[PDB]
Design a protein around this ligand. Structure first.
Ligand SMILES: CCCCCCCC/C=C/CCCCCCCC(=O)O[C@@H](COC(=O)CCCCCCCCCCCCCCC)COP(=O)([O-])OCC[N+](C)(C)C
Ligand SMILES: CCCCCCCC/C=C/CCCCCCCC(=O)O[C@@H](COC(=O)CCCCCCCCCCCCCCC)COP(=O)([O-])OCC[N+](C)(C)C
Ligand SMILES: CCCCCCCC/C=C/CCCCCCCC(=O)O[C@@H](COC(=O)CCCCCCCCCCCCCCC)COP(=O)([O-])OCC[N+](C)(C)C
Ligand SMILES: CCCCCCCC/C=C\CCCCCCCC(=O)O[C@@H](COC(=O)CCCCCCCCCCCCCCC)COP(=O)([O-])OCC[N+](C)(C)C
Ligand SMILES: CCCCCCCC/C=C\CCCCCCCC(=O)O[C@@H](COC(=O)CCCCCCCCCCCCCCC)COP(=O)([O-])OCC[N+](C)(C)C
Ligand SMILES: O=C1N=c2cc([N+](=O)[O-])c([N+](=O)[O-])cc2=NC1=O
Ligand SMILES: O=C1N=c2cc([N+](=O)[O-])c([N+](=O)[O-])cc2=NC1=O
Ligand SMILES: O=S1(=O)NCN(C2CC2)c2ccc(F)cc21
Ligand SMILES: O=S1(=O)NCN(C2CC2)c2ccc(F)cc21
Ligand SMILES: O=S1(=O)NCN(C2CC2)c2ccc(F)cc21
Ligand SMILES: O=S1(=O)NCN(C2CC2)c2ccc(F)cc21
Ligand SMILES: [Cl-]
Ligand code: NA
Ligand code: NA
Ligand code: NA
Ligand code: NA
Ligand code: NA
Ligand code: NA
Ligand code: NA
Lengths: 420, 420, 420, 420
């Protein structure tokens, strides 16, 4: 006779086909556990009739009397022959029904939003000093160079002889004009000295204190840039639950009374009870009621959702903003459910192991869990200083070579007006 | 018998549950002393049946009537059978009731605000070299340039032809005068070369060694400042009670008529009687009325709040800018009270010693005192240095320009005196 | 009945105790499978009574006689009652014996030597700026000095009196030639000033902007190198199997006639058949005879050793220069064997699922696979930089001096051609 | 009658007095528990006779029949009245004897050798580059400057006119002698350019490649010095057992079957079972048999001994090379032992609490646990670069100013021989 396969609606598992023809005859279904059910029926002979569970439930000790609702009800009443579905092999179900041997391995892992292209700025060289320090240095270049001008006109020792070769006199000039006083201050600031040095002691205390001011500015730029660039290099993203146990800034998640939330209750691993101390205290904010609303709260907030790995690897392949941070915490499996007795327990256990040696259970997971190929990495590595973080010293370079053409035209016109 | 348990309302010892439907009846509230009273009752038979004390006190002997208040009046009149609460084992209570053997150990310790590092000074650029090094560099410039003035006069090759711009002969002049030798030493130190370069070989060895000296000093300033900025290490001004006995800048704090104030009043230790000489003099300048009023004055005023040490370990893990400085000053203990003739003294004394070696007094304390955790050991991208960090190079700049005006006037008078 | 348990000698599964007096009798040895066989026996009645297999094999079907070897011959002849050992659930064994439901989960993964950072290259000084930046600076020197040659000829104030050493007039000469403008740009870039300083205002804006450009580039080189040297971050050349399918420089490894070599022989995946195209061609060039011989060739030769994933997690925590690259390739499992007609299949299937949810399969694995820990995340005081780190500045120095001889000969010929 | 005080030999507890007079009459004893026994007898009236335990044992379940050897034998047989001794209040003893209430609080803490004055060298500035790099730079200053000399004599474009003021000829000189070629190479190396720049393209490629070599040397000195100085600042010493659980380099200790070794057996704190995994595996090396041999193994090896806090605070005050790293792990206490019944249980419990309010139990611990005042700190803080780590640039400074006097004498003599 044709077997009765009691299954449930899940994705990429048993689904509905997108079509319109109303008379189906168990051809309305599609998914991983329908492609698995064809290949079990192929090598074991049987015909089958896919009849969904009416309760829409997997299986649960009802704990007032224990009527075992769901797909384990259809098996324990012998109303069903198979339960080809994601029917997880757990302890309380193995006593009342006979599973097959696993066709799927999962655990508990963490969803998180994928870290993206950090933009520290095109003008991000300007960060190691405060925005008033860059102003107070520029107001000290305009301040010292005016004090250089006043002192070098007033001190009698700067008024040297511009032609000492001929030992005569009557021509006495400073090299410190107003234009050459800013060029000392700009020149001494940029660590590359100008063509003109102070000659009097009163101007050698201006120049000698503008040189010490300049050392502390350039050294505290280089040492605070070293402090910025080595902290963001020392900063590594979270890649574990041992990481999540420490940062209370990144928020945890689970499902209301699921297999994940049950695991963190009965836990003596001592990382995960601290992860349960987060949940019992901060409940009704960190404890969402479904798998789909847990994805949305990662996608809105800074939320780290604790899902099973078979539906983390499904959502991550369909949403390149999402990632899986770490490894398997638990270790569970999916098995074809059978009632107790059931000569098809061993026949499917042989049949699953035959499809694993041939490699079909990997080709059926790649057929349903790939979806789209992601935009690859966009070179997500870093730490070499490039155009995206030091590339705004090229705008300032280009804006200084355009302004100098505006003055070179302006000097050519003022010289031409001088000829008239 | 349910054995009525008198109990006061304290945190994190006896806290209301406050989650749902407000009707339980002796399941209304939770905490450390209620988890303790469970595993006493689990080993020793009975049920909880807490009967929270009407008068909100622990117990004290008013001398006007010689009567007891709080809980230890409810013990002696046998209208309570236990006192499972933070009831401290004091001498005057031990003569009246009998205590069990302690379930917590504590003393007197000090709250102080956690060190911050937002005011490092205004000469905090001067830190990466010790003040012995900043003086030895200043004595090296005076040392080298006095060697340069001696060598360059004595060396025959520093005396040259001071006009090759017209080939005439019989002219012998040196460039290294006294002012021109200190300007080489200052100029070579500030990484910006002066207009004077040595010529013979001997001043090129004084010149070349002073250049290698200078690279090692500037690179050690830049690389120790780059260590000071990425690794922030804050230091508190006090780390004990004798260090806090000396600081009159930091004012103290304790509850008026508490177990802490009675310790310093009755003390004979030279530190703890000097510490009473402060807070008896000031007296409502440094004496708050409760524990919560004193915690706020650590947060608002400066402060030094002398309180019990289990209440500090509670508050230090909720607030992350409150820290415990020093160790325990007194040594006291919380014991479960019981009436004078009571079998439950010894039976709980055995029971408290049973949960300890099994480890349950520690695991309850890990449950009810731990909190957020304060995980701020990962530094932010250090700081944009402002006028709070470099800061005092704008002070020494203006101090060097005011000094330059006073030399320019002095060179203006020394020339007009030469005209006379 | 003691129920004779056949068992093979493996690590860290079945290890001799070796501490004292050599006479116990089925208490001689310890491990993971013996801790497992305890808590199976603790729940299910019986005592251990291990009866270690004489023929040191697991079981294989020689086709010449169709007989079984190892343990799974000792199961089918009912001369053993359990097989508590790493007996892998294979298809041909499942048709012959019945397995329990898995107590470990594993697959195929890759050993590779942990990345080292002792050969960063010889041009590893060039890393703190990206190769786009090293080209844009070279195009900036060509860009600025071609602007300097245009502006300084056009600016009327760069043309001056080129001998104030004798006051004679009617002489108009510029210092910014073509060779003298690239020497300003190279000189100002290398932080060491050339003998040419601009004079007008327009070349002082080209000069002053190129000085501020240069401070930001040299300070960003020094501060990103100071991040690269204190935070060592090593990268492996391979992190998967398809990245290792491409690298012909890295040769593979697997046991001859193992469960891993049979996977790649029978595969149809485009990567895992390309990976078989390598190691079937080479064949005793990349095929070791055991697991221990293959681990040594990762340590001595380069290597890529494809083996099981629980043996990697054992070896990766003993050696701290062996690492696991990539994830699991196959998916298999270790199941407790039992004979074909056996009640102990289902009773241990319930029992393995009982220790899992209580957490005992994880806590046994934490006991027997963990080791030293490899705690080398704290860096040593970084490195004295040698000819392995800076290194290639002695190459570009000698390449710049050999190029200088070829220009000096070319200037010697261009002068002797001018004599003709 | 006179009570019988059964005590044991311990330090600073019950000892022998250093004298010679043989007829004592319980005046041969001295220590903390003898000064405590005087003050208990003072306020409770009784006279006492100190009679040591003959077994020399504290107390132990003999576990073949349980004869309770030691000081608990003298109490349970009523052969003793008091047990004024460090008789620790533990669970199994409280059932068979009656302790008093504690006169002493301890726990479990860690001995370690105190970190001392680190000598990184007086010449410790020389560390950021390898000792062959400092040689290869000094051989490249002697190598380039000889290539400068050969090219500047051979290139026809360096032979300029040393007096271009007069437009005549016949005097043509280089400024690149052999002496001025080393002064370029030394001058360009020290980031402070000399008075002489190259004039030909063949010498501007030598100078232009010696300037790029120099930038990478000074930047990789400053960035590797920043890497040295920020790693030893990021390196903090161990101050916990959470620290000791990670470093497998620092070796643990305990006593053979003591109260400390028993605590790490029965431990679920999950830091300390890893600390027991160190002990069971590495036994007979990390597990010494007495408290005195554990002190010696800290004092010889890098060993971290787990002792009680009352004898860590005794040894640390007598040996300034030893320290206590962390806090109390366990929490125990010392009580006066009494048999069951015993009207002196409550009388001493009142008497101990009276001596605690007056503060005598702190004055009796300071009398016996101080010993010597330690040499204070010798300023054990750090991280400001001082004379002990950069002070060898002052020897090289002083050795260059002495060598230059030797050349200044040598130039004065060669000039004097030139006059002849
Ligand atoms: C890259 C640079 C390295 C190499 C170059 C080194 C250059 C050599 C010169 C170095 C001079 C440095 C002064 C040494 C003072 C040491 C004492 C001290 O630490 O504290 C005192 C500093 O009080 C002051 O006066 C600081 C003044 C700084 C500049 C003074 C000379 C100006 C430079 C002249 C230019 C020509 C000099 C050349 C020769 C004449 C007291 O201040 P404080 O407030 O108590 O600070 C601590 C408290 N706080 C932080 C919490 C606020
Ligand atoms: C403080 C300094 C910053 C500011 C100053 C910057 C100065 C501006 C000049 C910058 C020139 C730098 C060249 C950059 C090349 C980029 C490509 C690359 O990264 O790899 C290539 C480098 O191969 C080479 O050839 C490197 C040669 C370096 C010096 C070349 C010019 C000489 C200096 C001219 C002096 C006058 C110049 C002035 C204008 C003429 C290939 O090598 P690789 O082996 O594949 O390396 C990776 C592999 N490995 C590490 C694992 C081994
Ligand atoms: C930013 C700077 C880079 C660029 C500048 C490069 C500078 C030039 C190259 C310099 C090479 C230096 C050689 C040292 C090699 C190490 C050997 C050694 O340690 O022996 C001795 C050190 O010996 C010295 O102290 C040497 C002092 C430096 C020489 C100064 C010359 C300046 C001019 C040069 C002009 C060029 C000459 C051309 C002339 C025409 C002993 O020291 P120690 O045993 O280690 O001390 C014990 C403590 N410790 C072990 C704990 C650490
Ligand atoms: C004549 C020139 C020789 C001088 C040499 C100098 C060498 C060493 C000199 C000083 C070092 C010794 C300092 C010891 C500590 C004293 C504390 C102190 O004064 O700090 C005070 C200021 O700090 C200063 O003002 C420092 C003086 C700077 C002017 C010197 C310029 C000389 C430049 C030489 C050029 C070379 C010329 C070359 C020659 C050819 C701090 O005061 P405050 O209370 O914290 O203020 C807070 C203000 N607030 C409220 C706004 C926040
Ligand atoms: C694979 C790499 C190629 C090399 C081949 C490998 C092997 C070599 C094989 C053969 C040797 C080839 C060398 C050329 C011929 C030798 C003689 C000579 O130079 O001729 C003449 C032209 O002089 C010049 O070429 C330079 C002067 C003009 C400037 C040109 C742009 C400068 C950029 C270049 C550097 C960019 C770096 C900086 C960029 C920021 C010499 O005349 P001059 O006296 O020098 O100039 C006259 C001005 N003066 C009269 C006022 C004084
Ligand atoms: O056996 C089960 N299988 C499940 C399978 C899935 N699944 O996603 O395939 C889910 N779930 O949707 O979270 C819950 C399950 N609960 C179960 O009890
Ligand atoms: O009750 C005890 N008291 C002890 C006191 C001490 N003590 O040092 O005073 C020691 N000990 O010497 O390690 C061991 C002890 N063991 C005990 O069981
Ligand atoms: O629930 S099971 O059928 N038996 C228990 N386990 C594990 C021991 C890890 C596993 C591990 C992976 C599976 F696919 C199934 C199971
Ligand atoms: O009030 S007690 O029961 N007896 C006196 N003492 C101390 C001697 C320190 C201590 C010390 C710690 C406690 F927990 C209890 C007490
Ligand atoms: O050999 S099995 O018992 N059945 C087949 N499989 C897999 C489907 C992957 C797995 C996967 C993990 C196991 F632990 C066991 C098995
Ligand atoms: O062995 S006891 O008499 N009772 C148990 N405890 C502690 C709860 C920490 C303590 C703590 C400190 C003591 F001094 C005595 C004891
Ligand atoms: Cl008691
Ligand atoms: Na079953
Ligand atoms: Na310069
Ligand atoms: Na750094
Ligand atoms: Na009493
Ligand atoms: Na079978
Ligand atoms: Na730096
Ligand atoms: Na007792």
């Amino acid at each position: 006779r044709s077997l009765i396969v009691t299954t449930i609606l899940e994705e990429p598992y048993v689904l509905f086909k997108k079509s319109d023809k109303p008379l189906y005859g168990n051809d309305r279904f599609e998914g991983y556990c329908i492609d698995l059910l064809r290949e079990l029926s192929t090598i074991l002979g049987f015909t089958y009739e896919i009849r969904l569970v009416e309760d829409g439930k997997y299986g649960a000790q009802d704990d007032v009397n224990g009527q075992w609702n769901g797909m384990v009800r259809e098996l324990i009443d012998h109303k069903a022959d198979l339960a080809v579905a994601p029917l997880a092999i757990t302890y309380v179900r193995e006593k009342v029904i006979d599973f097959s041997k696993p066709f799927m391995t999962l655990g508990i892992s963490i969803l998180y939003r994928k870290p993206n292209g950090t933009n520290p700025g095109v003008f991000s060289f300007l960060n190691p000093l405060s925005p008033d320090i860059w102003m107070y240095v520029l107001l000290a270049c305009l301040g010292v160079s005016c004090v250089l001008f006043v002192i070098a006109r007033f001190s009698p020792y700067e008024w040297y002889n511009p032609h000492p070769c001929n030992p005569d006199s009557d021509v006495v000039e400073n090299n410190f004009t107003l234009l050459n006083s800013f060029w000392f201050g700009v020149g001494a600031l940029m660590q590359q000295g100008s063509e003109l040095m102070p000659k009097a002691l009163s101007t050698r205390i201006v120049g000698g204190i503008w040189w010490f001011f300049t050392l502390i500015i350039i050294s505290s730029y280089t040492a605070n840039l070293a402090a910025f660039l080595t902290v963001e290099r020392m900063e590594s993203p979270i890649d574990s639950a041992d990481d999540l146990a420490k940062q209370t800034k990144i928020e945890y998640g689970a499902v209301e009374d699921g297999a994940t939330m049950t695991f963190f209750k009965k836990s003596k691993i001592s990382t995960y009870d601290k992860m349960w101390a987060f949940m019992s205290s901060r409940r009704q904010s960190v404890l969402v009621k479904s798998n789909e609303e847990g994805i949305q709260r990662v996608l809105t907030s800074d939320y780290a959702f604790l899902m099973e790995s078979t539906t983390i690897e499904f959502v991550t392949q369909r949403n390149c903003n999402l990632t899986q941070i770490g490894g398997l915490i638990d270790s569970k499996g999916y098995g074809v459910g059978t009632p107790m007795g059931s000569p098809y327990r061993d026949k499917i256990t042989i049949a699953i192991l035959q499809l694993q040696e041939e490699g079909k259970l990997h080709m059926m997971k790649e057929k349903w869990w790939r979806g789209n190929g992601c935009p690859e990495e966009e070179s997500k590595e870093a730490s070499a200083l490039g155009v995206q973080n030091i590339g705004g010293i090229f705008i300032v370079l280009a804006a200084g070579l355009v302004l100098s053409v505006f003055v070179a035209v302006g000097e050519f016109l003022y010289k031409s007006k001088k000829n008239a």
